[PDB]
Design an enzyme around this catalytic site. Structure first.
Site, mmCIF file in Angstrom:
data_model
loop_
_atom_site.group_PDB
_atom_site.id
_atom_site.type_symbol
_atom_site.label_atom_id
_atom_site.label_comp_id
_atom_site.label_asym_id
_atom_site.label_seq_id
_atom_site.Cartn_x
_atom_site.Cartn_y
_atom_site.Cartn_z
ATOM 1 N N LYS D 22 0.815 -1.205 0.000
ATOM 2 C CA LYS D 22 0.000 0.000 0.000
ATOM 3 C C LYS D 22 0.848 1.254 0.000
ATOM 4 O O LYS D 22 2.074 1.191 0.074
ATOM 5 C CB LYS D 22 -0.929 0.019 1.199
ATOM 6 C CG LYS D 22 -2.079 -0.913 1.064
ATOM 7 C CD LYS D 22 -2.863 -0.542 -0.160
ATOM 8 C CE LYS D 22 -4.104 -1.375 -0.245
ATOM 9 N NZ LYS D 22 -4.992 -0.890 -1.320
ATOM 10 N N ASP D 51 1.433 3.508 -12.017
ATOM 11 C CA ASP D 51 0.879 4.425 -11.038
ATOM 12 C C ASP D 51 0.840 5.860 -11.556
ATOM 13 O O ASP D 51 1.760 6.301 -12.246
ATOM 14 C CB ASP D 51 1.681 4.353 -9.735
ATOM 15 C CG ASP D 51 3.016 5.087 -9.807
ATOM 16 O OD1 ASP D 51 3.610 5.166 -10.900
ATOM 17 O OD2 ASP D 51 3.477 5.597 -8.766
ATOM 18 N N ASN D 224 10.372 -1.189 6.334
ATOM 19 C CA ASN D 224 10.961 0.093 5.993
ATOM 20 C C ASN D 224 10.982 1.026 7.194
ATOM 21 O O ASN D 224 10.157 0.917 8.101
ATOM 22 C CB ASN D 224 10.188 0.738 4.849
ATOM 23 C CG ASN D 224 10.849 1.974 4.342
ATOM 24 O OD1 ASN D 224 12.011 2.227 4.633
ATOM 25 N ND2 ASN D 224 10.111 2.766 3.580
ATOM 26 N N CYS D 238 11.958 9.659 20.160
ATOM 27 C CA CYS D 238 12.472 8.577 19.344
ATOM 28 C C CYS D 238 12.696 7.321 20.165
ATOM 29 O O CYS D 238 12.569 6.216 19.637
ATOM 30 C CB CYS D 238 13.773 9.015 18.671
ATOM 31 S SG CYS D 238 13.564 10.329 17.447
HETATM 32 ZN ZN LIG Z 1 13.669 12.801 17.579
#
Ligand SMILES: [Zn+2]
Lengths: 218, 293, 218, 293
Positions: D22, D51, D224, D238
């Site tokens: 997707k 596409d 990914n 993070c």
């Molecule tokens: Zn950060």
């Protein structure tokens, strides 16, 4: 009811040609009897082309003639909505081209507005298909019997009226009494003929000419 | 439009509230924030959950079961996270063959008797939370499923069968009145949530046009985890993440700015639990935080 | 063919009671004639209960008797697979409970293994529904005619055989010649009766007793 | 299993490669990385895109159109981003009514004549990229759609109709041989991509069991943007983002570690363009980067 699934389970346990040749001979003598000798023969002549179209019937292609019959009248409501249907279909395919041409990334709002118009018209599309195909198959079912009355009313009226009134007289002494029996039943005077073999077996007279056309095109 | 939920507070003739979407969004935090800020101006508010994640225990560190009660710190917080499989325990051979005849039976009857217990009391308003959507929206189909099932059971008949026949008739009339209360729109509302990426927006629009095909509107849509930059401090990955987040944010601005509301809610460093921390998280649904952007 | 859609489009354009009373009187005299006077009357007596079951027919409920007919034989292959069907259905509902009880977060692998077994068995479920419901409706279509042969074979054999052989003699002089005409057609000697009114109108004799049962239960 | 794509290199009897999933995943970067690392050991490799995002122009800053060519820096890079609407331009009244009779006609015939041009040359292998899936998987349905359409056109018949009849028969036999080449599995393979969140994993499993219902296997799955911590430097958001990413990562470890491959690919600070930068991005599909984890 089908007599075929009953035959599918039945596996679980363990003159007419010489008849058509004599109808050919009586048709030969009926065709010879007109030259040396009126209106009822032309009535049989039109019923022969009616039975011919019964043979060369396109039960859809008769309605293909009915299509241009109703592609003709401008005061028709349905052909008007048929044109409005194609117009909405044209606008439909137009926005569908603009849809598939667009991208799902950077016109996502325009994406949704196109998608909304797409399924907007997609529902009203088959509403007309439900309307008009219903009208067309009902109109066909009307006119099938509408023709069938003009066919079989003449297929039985001829035997109702003008039965005692003799159409023509058989030569005296050619046929045995038992053959003559046929004449006695429709009220025609003994020694004259009725109007039956002209109804059913006269269809064979043109049938060979039908296969003559089968040699013409092919 | 107005970036708050003030219109839900302002009507007061509302009775039922539906809030949903998909996973990975933390709907429970949104639900408890809605309930607590609702309780400031309300009388008798009940929460109801059916998700198999027993999350309200995580919301308050207090075990709950198959009965409502008041939890500490509040005079109005009532909830009971229930299971549909208890009704299947009620089924534990012909009724199971009936469940073979129709793949869904017991969940609607359980939801039915639940809602009878709901209308047993005199509560002011209620709220909801649900599983993924294809498993949710069948509740608008429960009245029809109930009717088909009752007809079929009677078809086989052609222990007492009349008792379950009358029981299913009571379930029929009750579910018809409740679904009839649904389309009233003066006591039944719907809010959906989403997050700034593609697929969340995708199924969000699918849900909206889905409810458009049932004749129930909405006007308020909440998003989540909208990271805003800290002054001075910066992570370089967070910069581009903010950039892409703005990209979809402005696209939602291109859609819903006409007749819907947008709720900006930033992520905090911790999974916000505890009563007072949930109060501070719930405060933003009225006062929208806005940095200079 | 249906004569109903043709009637749905037809909207687009713009003695028997006194007959049953005389069959009641002849049944009274036929019932009186046995006491002062054999086997064929008991044959009509069984055909009366056959026509009764034709009336109090459950065309499904006869097959409801056929259900316990085939819930009886242990050497039946199909009732064996019916039990295997319910066994697979029980394991089906078991894993479905374990599915809906599970969570889609922390057993996502177990989630998928359950989902795979779910749609694994879901396809084999209706394969048996296609098998057995086909067998059941075909077996019903066999035995409907299988009973119908025993019914109408006795409904026409009685008139075939034992027709010239007189069943009983009418009193001399009670009926006009034209009424007596009925006797002349089935070969029975003049002055005796045939076996017709016992076939069709004797169904009315028990029909009032049928409504007697209508007063019994209701 | 082996965390690389070495098995695709090792067969060499492969001809067709399907890669999808997707949006929001950057499949074009994956596609070009596959093609470039494929070209190290291959002879004639063709890329094909459909596409509407004209992304290979963004991949190489060079305009392409409706004809294949070689792009600079390579002796084997051939591609042509095409449109299906050109065939509708070929349609620009009865054939449009035929498109009303069946909602999809022209896209399959365009894909057909494209594949005839494909089998015109003598290329070694090809690769693909597609739109969202509900618009993709219809190509396994194109042979049936083609048959139904041809039958219907003939139904109306009951300008020359025999010319389009023979043209559709040529399209029929060609698409039957190509779909027949699909299930061979010695020249047709399939890889899918996803990212660590809920819905991406959700539709990924839906795709896998979808191809399971057509009898085409797979063995390799790429993910990914798998952020790994920098030594010493840290963003506090993070950290928790890495924690949640590990949570779904280990769940995929609980599924696919038996007979599939996992490709770890980290996000870089920039949208990787340019030839040499794409080379470095493509290098990791053979040598898997692994920090101590
Ligand atoms: Zn950060």
């Amino acid at each position: 009811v089908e007599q075929a699934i009953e035959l599918a389970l039945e596996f679980f346990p363990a003159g007419m040609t010489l008849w058509r040749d004599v109808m050919l001979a009586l048709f030969v003598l009926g065709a010879v009897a007109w030259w040396r000798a009126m209106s009822l023969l032309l009535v049989i002549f039109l019923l022969e082309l009616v039975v011919q179209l019964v043979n060369t019937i396109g039960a859809k292609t008769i309605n293909n003639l009915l299509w241009r019959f109703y592609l003709s009248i401008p005061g028709s409501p349905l052909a008007k909505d048929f044109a409005e249907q194609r117009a909405k279909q044209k606008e439909y395919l137009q926005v569908r081209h603009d849809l598939n041409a667009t991208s799902s990334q950077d016109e996502f709002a325009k994406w949704a507005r196109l998608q909304r118009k797409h399924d907007k018209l997609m529902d009203e599309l088959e509403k007309k298909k439900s309307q008009l195909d219903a009208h067309r198959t009902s109109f066909s079912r009307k006119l099938t019997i509408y023709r069938w009355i003009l066919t079989r009313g003449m297929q039985w009226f001829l035997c109702f009226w003008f039965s005692s009134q003799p159409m023509f007289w058989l030569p005296y002494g050619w046929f045995p009494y038992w053959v003559e029996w046929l004449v006695s039943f429709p009220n025609a005077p003994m020694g004259s003929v009725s109007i039956v073999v002209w109804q059913s077996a006269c269809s064979g007279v043109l049938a060979l000419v039908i296969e003559a056309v089968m040699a013409v095109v092919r | 439009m107005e970036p708050t939920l003030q219109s839900i507070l302002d009507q007061r003739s509302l009775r039922w509230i539906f809030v949903g979407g998909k996973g990975g969004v933390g709907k429970t935090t949104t639900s408890c924030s809605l309930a607590i800020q609702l309780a400031k101006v309300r009388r008798s508010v009940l929460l109801l959950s059916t998700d198999p994640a027993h999350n309200l225990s995580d919301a308050f560190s207090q075990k709950f079961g198959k009965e409502a009660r008041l939890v500490e710190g509040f005079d109005n917080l009532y909830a009971m996270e229930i299971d549909p499989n208890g009704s299947m325990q009620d089924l534990l051979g012909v009724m199971q063959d009936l469940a073979y005849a129709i793949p869904g039976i017991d969940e609607a009857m359980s939801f039915a008797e639940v809602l009878k217990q709901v209308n047993s009391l005199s509560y002011e308003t209620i709220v909801f939370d649900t599983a993924p959507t294809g498993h949710t929206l069948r509740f608008l189909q429960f009245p029809t499923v109930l009717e088909k099932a009752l007809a079929k059971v009677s078809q086989l008949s052609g222990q007492t069968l009349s008792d379950v026949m009358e029981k299913l008739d009571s379930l029929r009339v009750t579910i018809s009145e409740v679904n009839a209360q649904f389309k009233d729109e003066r006591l039944t509302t719907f809010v959906c949530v989403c997050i700034p990426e593609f697929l969340s927006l995708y199924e969000t629009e699918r849900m909206i046009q889905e409810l458009a095909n049932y004749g129930i509107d909405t006007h308020c849509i909440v998003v989540n985890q909208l990271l805003f930059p800290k002054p001075g401090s910066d992570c370089e990955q967070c910069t581009a993440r903010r950039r892409m987040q703005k990209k979809y944010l402005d696209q939602i601005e291109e859609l819903y700015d006409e007749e819907f509301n947008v709720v900006k809610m930033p992520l905090l460093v911790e999974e916000v639990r505890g009563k007072e921390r949930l109060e501070k998280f719930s405060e933003m649904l009225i006062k929208p935080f806005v940095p200079p952007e």
